[PDB]
């Protein structure tokens, strides 16, 4: 259905080493990401999926959006881990990758896996959100990580509110528990559209 270029922003921050999402937030995220790359690429053969990491040794685009699922998934192996997510830099870069998409018919979507504290002012985030809304970028936020920042879901909801257009943007708040991160997302619009 939806023809979409999606840029998936991966949290590879130090917070991802945490095993509160078994076996690690990184692994829980990687599986969700892989499934999402699969679901996005298979929902429409002209969908493209790119991946960037938000943290580590700096924001890094693993692949710009591509239909090449093997290339996408190959990016998920051997991620570096450290630092803090640079959510704004990641969204900025993700936006650029999406504006640069070859098939302009594509809708543009950033998926953010926020598995670590959102250290940016809420107002700064609603700004980002409105910027994305102006630039016709939908945003899905996967909010996970029990790091005890209570502002985060609200900050990310505020980011969500600002960017959301025609119900194209979504936030899923996924605490750790009996369900893997990916299993929780499978029933959400992050996966169902």
């Amino acid at each position: 259905p939806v023809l979409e270029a999606t840029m998936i922003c991966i949290d590879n921050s130090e917070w991802m080493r945490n095993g509160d999402y078994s076996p690690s937030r990184l692994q829980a995220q990687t599986e969700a990401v892989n499934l999402l790359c699969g679901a996005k690429t298979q929902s429409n053969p002209e969908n493209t999926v790119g991946i960037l990491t938000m943290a580590g040794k700096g924001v890094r685009v693993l692949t710009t959006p591509t239909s090449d699922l093997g290339k996408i998934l190959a990016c998920m192996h051997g991620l570096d881990v450290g630092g803090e997510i640079n959510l704004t830099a990641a969204i900025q870069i993700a936006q650029l990758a999406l504006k640069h998409r070859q098939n302009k018919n594509q809708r543009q979507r950033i998926i953010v896996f926020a598995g670590s504290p959102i250290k940016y002012e809420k107002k700064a985030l609603e700004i980002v959100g409105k910027r994305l809304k102006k630039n016709s970028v939908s945003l899905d936020i996967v909010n996970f990580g029990e790091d005890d920042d209570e502002e985060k879901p609200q900050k990310l909801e505020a980011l969500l509110t600002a960017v959301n257009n025609n119900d194209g943007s979504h936030i899923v708040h996924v605490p750790s528990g009996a369900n893997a991160l990916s299993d929780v997302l499978l029933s959400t619009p992050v996966f169902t559209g």
Partner: protein
Amino acid sequence: PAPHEERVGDMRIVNITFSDINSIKNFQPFSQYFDFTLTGPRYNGNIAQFAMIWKIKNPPHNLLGVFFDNNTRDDEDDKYTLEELKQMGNGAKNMYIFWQYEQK
């Protein structure tokens, strides 16, 4: 930080790790090739539905399966190790090697 690549010739080798093979049930397109009743990691001789049936020989304990995304290859149980399968893409552009995350 640099791109990881594993490949044999033109065929990318894509290592994917799951803590539970059952997660792959929700992994498009790969799920369509898995027969989740099978014991022992399998590879596919072709990209028919449910093709991952051929027992990989002496698989690593954490090997879940191998999916080659195109073309066809010899189809035998307990003959081809995972390493040998890496030579058996036969034109496949991607060899997906599914691995089980081993915690602790």
